[PDB]
Design a protein around this ligand. Sequence first.
Ligand code: 7FM
Length: 250
Amino acid sequence: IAREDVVLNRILGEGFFGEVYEGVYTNHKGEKINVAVKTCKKDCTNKEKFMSEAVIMKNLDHPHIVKLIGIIEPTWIIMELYPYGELGHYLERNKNSLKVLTLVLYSLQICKAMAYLESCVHRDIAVRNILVASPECVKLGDFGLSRIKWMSPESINFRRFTTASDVWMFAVCMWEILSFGKQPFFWLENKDVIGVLEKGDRLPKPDLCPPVLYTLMTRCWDYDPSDRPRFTELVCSLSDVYQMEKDIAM
Ligand SMILES: CS(=O)(=O)N1CCCCC(=O)N2CCc3cc(ccc32)Nc2ncc(C(F)(F)F)c(n2)NCc2cccnc21
Protein backbone atom coordinates (compact mmCIF):
# COMPACT_ATOMS: atom_id res chain seq x y z
CA ILE A 1 0.00 0.00 0.00
CA ALA A 2 1.30 3.47 -0.86
CA ARG A 3 1.03 6.16 1.82
CA GLU A 4 -0.72 8.62 -0.53
CA ASP A 5 -3.68 6.22 -0.65
CA VAL A 6 -4.26 6.54 3.12
CA VAL A 7 -5.52 9.81 4.65
CA LEU A 8 -5.63 10.31 8.44
CA ASN A 9 -8.75 12.05 9.76
CA ARG A 10 -8.51 11.94 13.55
CA ILE A 11 -7.05 10.26 16.61
CA LEU A 12 -8.67 6.94 17.53
CA GLY A 13 -6.54 6.31 20.61
CA GLU A 14 -3.23 5.23 22.12
CA GLY A 15 -2.33 1.70 21.06
CA PHE A 16 0.38 -0.39 22.69
CA PHE A 17 3.18 0.75 20.37
CA GLY A 18 1.89 4.19 19.50
CA GLU A 19 -1.05 6.24 18.36
CA VAL A 20 -3.88 4.73 16.33
CA TYR A 21 -5.72 6.99 13.85
CA GLU A 22 -9.03 6.88 12.04
CA GLY A 23 -8.56 7.33 8.34
CA VAL A 24 -9.68 6.47 4.83
CA TYR A 25 -7.94 4.14 2.40
CA THR A 26 -8.73 4.44 -1.32
CA ASN A 27 -8.37 1.30 -3.49
CA HIS A 28 -6.09 0.82 -6.49
CA LYS A 29 -9.56 0.53 -8.01
CA GLY A 30 -10.40 3.80 -6.26
CA GLU A 31 -13.04 2.78 -3.68
CA LYS A 32 -13.01 4.35 -0.19
CA ILE A 33 -12.62 2.24 2.96
CA ASN A 34 -12.72 3.48 6.56
CA VAL A 35 -9.56 2.29 8.31
CA ALA A 36 -7.75 2.22 11.62
CA VAL A 37 -4.10 3.08 11.21
CA LYS A 38 -1.68 1.71 13.79
CA THR A 39 1.66 3.48 14.13
CA CYS A 40 4.84 2.96 16.15
CA LYS A 41 6.33 5.70 18.39
CA LYS A 42 9.62 7.15 17.10
CA ASP A 43 11.06 6.38 20.55
CA CYS A 44 10.37 2.64 20.22
CA THR A 45 13.08 0.06 20.87
CA ASN A 46 9.44 -3.75 20.09
CA LYS A 47 9.60 -2.09 16.67
CA GLU A 48 10.24 -5.65 15.45
CA LYS A 49 7.48 -7.21 17.57
CA PHE A 50 5.20 -4.54 16.09
CA MET A 51 5.94 -5.71 12.55
CA SER A 52 5.92 -9.41 13.46
CA GLU A 53 2.50 -9.10 15.15
CA ALA A 54 1.40 -7.44 11.92
CA VAL A 55 2.74 -10.36 9.83
CA ILE A 56 0.64 -12.68 11.96
CA MET A 57 -2.50 -10.58 11.42
CA LYS A 58 -1.69 -10.47 7.70
CA ASN A 59 -1.86 -14.27 7.62
CA LEU A 60 -5.12 -14.58 9.55
CA ASP A 61 -8.48 -14.67 7.78
CA HIS A 62 -11.63 -15.27 9.72
CA PRO A 63 -15.02 -13.55 9.72
CA HIS A 64 -14.72 -12.97 13.46
CA ILE A 65 -11.22 -11.55 13.73
CA VAL A 66 -10.40 -7.93 12.81
CA LYS A 67 -9.19 -7.67 9.22
CA LEU A 68 -5.76 -6.35 8.27
CA ILE A 69 -6.03 -4.49 4.97
CA GLY A 70 -2.35 -3.88 4.36
CA ILE A 71 0.97 -2.66 5.66
CA ILE A 72 2.69 0.52 4.48
CA GLU A 73 6.19 -0.75 5.24
CA PRO A 74 7.14 5.57 9.42
CA THR A 75 5.52 2.12 9.42
CA TRP A 76 1.68 1.98 9.39
CA ILE A 77 -0.58 -1.08 9.87
CA ILE A 78 -3.84 -0.48 8.02
CA MET A 79 -6.72 -2.29 9.71
CA GLU A 80 -10.36 -2.25 8.72
CA LEU A 81 -12.25 0.19 10.97
CA TYR A 82 -15.40 -0.97 12.72
CA PRO A 83 -17.27 2.26 13.62
CA TYR A 84 -19.67 0.77 16.20
CA GLY A 85 -16.53 0.45 18.32
CA GLU A 86 -15.92 -1.80 21.32
CA LEU A 87 -18.35 -4.53 22.31
CA GLY A 88 -18.29 -3.60 26.00
CA HIS A 89 -19.56 -0.07 25.31
CA TYR A 90 -22.03 -1.36 22.69
CA LEU A 91 -23.53 -3.81 25.25
CA GLU A 92 -23.88 -1.10 27.90
CA ARG A 93 -25.50 1.40 25.52
CA ASN A 94 -27.86 -1.17 24.03
CA LYS A 95 -28.76 -3.32 27.01
CA ASN A 96 -32.41 -2.23 26.90
CA SER A 97 -32.80 -3.46 23.31
CA LEU A 98 -30.44 -6.48 23.07
CA LYS A 99 -31.96 -9.97 23.22
CA VAL A 100 -30.29 -13.09 24.64
CA LEU A 101 -30.22 -14.75 21.20
CA THR A 102 -27.81 -12.01 20.10
CA LEU A 103 -25.54 -12.32 23.13
CA VAL A 104 -25.34 -16.07 22.43
CA LEU A 105 -24.55 -15.30 18.79
CA TYR A 106 -21.65 -13.03 19.83
CA SER A 107 -20.33 -15.78 22.11
CA LEU A 108 -20.55 -18.37 19.32
CA GLN A 109 -18.74 -16.04 16.87
CA ILE A 110 -15.86 -15.46 19.30
CA CYS A 111 -15.74 -19.20 19.99
CA LYS A 112 -15.34 -19.90 16.29
CA ALA A 113 -12.56 -17.32 16.14
CA MET A 114 -10.83 -19.10 19.05
CA ALA A 115 -11.32 -22.55 17.52
CA TYR A 116 -9.65 -21.18 14.39
CA LEU A 117 -6.72 -19.67 16.32
CA GLU A 118 -6.29 -22.99 18.13
CA SER A 119 -6.11 -24.77 14.76
CA CYS A 120 -2.02 -19.32 18.19
CA VAL A 121 -3.55 -18.10 21.45
CA HIS A 122 -5.27 -14.90 22.40
CA ARG A 123 -4.34 -13.25 25.68
CA ASP A 124 -7.01 -10.51 25.66
CA ILE A 125 -10.39 -12.17 24.96
CA ALA A 126 -12.47 -9.50 26.68
CA VAL A 127 -15.31 -7.21 25.64
CA ARG A 128 -13.21 -4.03 25.60
CA ASN A 129 -11.00 -5.73 22.97
CA ILE A 130 -13.75 -7.05 20.70
CA LEU A 131 -15.09 -4.84 17.90
CA VAL A 132 -18.67 -4.62 16.67
CA ALA A 133 -18.74 -4.83 12.86
CA SER A 134 -22.54 -4.79 12.72
CA PRO A 135 -25.41 -5.57 15.14
CA GLU A 136 -25.04 -9.28 14.31
CA CYS A 137 -21.26 -9.50 13.84
CA VAL A 138 -18.31 -9.15 16.23
CA LYS A 139 -14.56 -9.31 15.60
CA LEU A 140 -11.83 -10.34 18.03
CA GLY A 141 -9.23 -7.53 18.26
CA ASP A 142 -5.55 -7.85 17.35
CA PHE A 143 -4.06 -6.71 20.68
CA GLY A 144 -3.11 -9.80 22.68
CA LEU A 145 -3.21 -12.12 19.67
CA SER A 146 -0.02 -14.18 19.70
CA ARG A 147 1.64 -17.57 19.08
CA ILE A 148 -5.88 -11.35 36.57
CA LYS A 149 -9.67 -11.47 36.95
CA TRP A 150 -9.71 -13.12 33.53
CA MET A 151 -7.05 -15.76 34.23
CA SER A 152 -7.17 -19.52 34.91
CA PRO A 153 -5.95 -20.87 38.28
CA GLU A 154 -2.88 -22.48 36.67
CA SER A 155 -2.15 -19.17 34.91
CA ILE A 156 -2.20 -17.45 38.30
CA ASN A 157 -0.63 -20.16 40.46
CA PHE A 158 2.03 -21.39 37.99
CA ARG A 159 2.27 -18.88 35.09
CA ARG A 160 1.11 -21.57 32.62
CA PHE A 161 -0.91 -20.43 29.59
CA THR A 162 -2.34 -23.23 27.42
CA THR A 163 -5.33 -23.57 25.11
CA ALA A 164 -7.21 -24.96 28.14
CA SER A 165 -6.43 -21.66 29.89
CA ASP A 166 -7.84 -19.76 26.91
CA VAL A 167 -11.05 -21.82 27.26
CA TRP A 168 -11.23 -20.55 30.86
CA MET A 169 -10.72 -16.98 29.69
CA PHE A 170 -13.26 -17.46 26.89
CA ALA A 171 -15.96 -18.37 29.42
CA VAL A 172 -15.06 -15.24 31.36
CA CYS A 173 -15.61 -13.30 28.13
CA MET A 174 -18.98 -15.09 27.74
CA TRP A 175 -19.88 -14.02 31.28
CA GLU A 176 -18.99 -10.40 30.43
CA ILE A 177 -21.16 -10.56 27.32
CA LEU A 178 -24.19 -12.05 29.08
CA SER A 179 -23.75 -9.49 31.88
CA PHE A 180 -23.83 -6.65 29.33
CA GLY A 181 -20.21 -5.69 29.86
CA LYS A 182 -19.77 -5.91 33.64
CA GLN A 183 -16.25 -6.58 34.92
CA PRO A 184 -15.63 -10.09 36.19
CA PHE A 185 -15.00 -10.13 39.95
CA PHE A 186 -15.55 -6.37 40.29
CA TRP A 187 -16.41 -7.13 43.92
CA LEU A 188 -12.93 -8.52 44.61
CA GLU A 189 -9.39 -7.24 44.87
CA ASN A 190 -6.89 -9.20 42.76
CA LYS A 191 -5.31 -10.87 45.81
CA ASP A 192 -8.62 -12.49 46.73
CA VAL A 193 -9.31 -14.09 43.33
CA ILE A 194 -7.35 -17.35 43.56
CA GLY A 195 -8.56 -18.22 47.07
CA VAL A 196 -12.15 -17.88 45.90
CA LEU A 197 -11.41 -20.11 42.90
CA GLU A 198 -9.65 -22.65 45.13
CA LYS A 199 -12.75 -22.79 47.36
CA GLY A 200 -14.83 -23.69 44.31
CA ASP A 201 -16.58 -20.33 44.00
CA ARG A 202 -17.20 -18.96 40.48
CA LEU A 203 -18.65 -15.92 38.69
CA PRO A 204 -22.42 -16.05 39.40
CA LYS A 205 -24.97 -16.76 36.62
CA PRO A 206 -25.91 -13.53 34.85
CA ASP A 207 -29.65 -12.76 34.94
CA LEU A 208 -30.25 -13.12 31.20
CA CYS A 209 -28.04 -16.19 30.92
CA PRO A 210 -29.82 -19.45 29.96
CA PRO A 211 -29.06 -22.12 32.60
CA VAL A 212 -27.63 -24.44 29.91
CA LEU A 213 -25.07 -21.78 28.98
CA TYR A 214 -24.11 -21.22 32.62
CA THR A 215 -23.54 -24.97 32.94
CA LEU A 216 -21.30 -24.68 29.89
CA MET A 217 -19.40 -21.75 31.47
CA THR A 218 -19.08 -23.81 34.63
CA ARG A 219 -17.40 -26.65 32.73
CA CYS A 220 -14.97 -24.15 31.19
CA TRP A 221 -14.08 -23.11 34.73
CA ASP A 222 -13.26 -26.67 35.80
CA TYR A 223 -10.28 -26.29 38.15
CA ASP A 224 -8.48 -29.20 36.41
CA PRO A 225 -7.71 -27.87 32.90
CA SER A 226 -7.75 -31.36 31.36
CA ASP A 227 -11.47 -31.69 32.13
CA ARG A 228 -12.40 -28.38 30.45
CA PRO A 229 -14.14 -28.58 27.06
CA ARG A 230 -12.06 -27.91 23.94
CA PHE A 231 -12.96 -25.09 21.56
CA THR A 232 -14.26 -27.49 18.89
CA GLU A 233 -16.68 -29.03 21.39
CA LEU A 234 -17.72 -25.54 22.54
CA VAL A 235 -18.56 -24.47 19.00
CA CYS A 236 -20.93 -27.43 18.75
CA SER A 237 -22.43 -26.81 22.17
CA LEU A 238 -22.88 -23.08 21.52
CA SER A 239 -24.34 -23.75 18.10
CA ASP A 240 -26.95 -25.94 19.79
CA VAL A 241 -27.71 -23.30 22.41
CA TYR A 242 -28.02 -20.68 19.67
CA GLN A 243 -30.41 -22.77 17.55
CA MET A 244 -32.52 -23.50 20.59
CA GLU A 245 -32.69 -19.83 21.66
CA LYS A 246 -33.62 -18.95 18.09
CA ASP A 247 -36.61 -21.33 18.19
CA ILE A 248 -37.63 -20.09 21.63
CA ALA A 249 -37.42 -16.48 20.34
CA MET A 250 -39.45 -17.06 17.17
C1 7FM B 1 -7.02 2.25 22.70
S1 7FM B 1 -6.84 1.97 20.95
O1 7FM B 1 -6.12 0.72 20.75
O2 7FM B 1 -6.35 3.21 20.38
N1 7FM B 1 -8.52 1.76 20.59
C2 7FM B 1 -9.39 2.95 20.32
C3 7FM B 1 -10.44 3.14 21.42
C4 7FM B 1 -11.39 4.29 21.09
C5 7FM B 1 -12.74 4.10 21.78
C6 7FM B 1 -13.85 4.80 21.01
O3 7FM B 1 -14.35 5.78 21.56
N2 7FM B 1 -14.28 4.37 19.75
C7 7FM B 1 -15.35 5.10 19.04
C8 7FM B 1 -15.18 4.78 17.55
C9 7FM B 1 -14.38 3.52 17.62
C10 7FM B 1 -14.12 2.64 16.58
C11 7FM B 1 -13.34 1.51 16.84
C12 7FM B 1 -12.84 1.29 18.14
C13 7FM B 1 -13.11 2.19 19.17
C14 7FM B 1 -13.88 3.30 18.91
N3 7FM B 1 -13.07 0.63 15.78
C15 7FM B 1 -11.93 -0.14 15.54
N4 7FM B 1 -11.98 -0.93 14.45
C16 7FM B 1 -10.90 -1.70 14.24
C17 7FM B 1 -9.77 -1.70 15.04
C18 7FM B 1 -8.64 -2.60 14.72
F1 7FM B 1 -8.84 -3.41 13.64
F2 7FM B 1 -7.47 -1.97 14.50
F3 7FM B 1 -8.45 -3.42 15.78
C19 7FM B 1 -9.78 -0.86 16.14
N5 7FM B 1 -10.86 -0.09 16.37
N6 7FM B 1 -8.76 -0.74 17.06
C20 7FM B 1 -8.72 0.28 18.07
C21 7FM B 1 -9.14 -0.30 19.41
C22 7FM B 1 -9.65 -1.59 19.50
C23 7FM B 1 -10.04 -2.11 20.74
C24 7FM B 1 -9.89 -1.32 21.87
N7 7FM B 1 -9.39 -0.06 21.83
C25 7FM B 1 -9.03 0.41 20.60
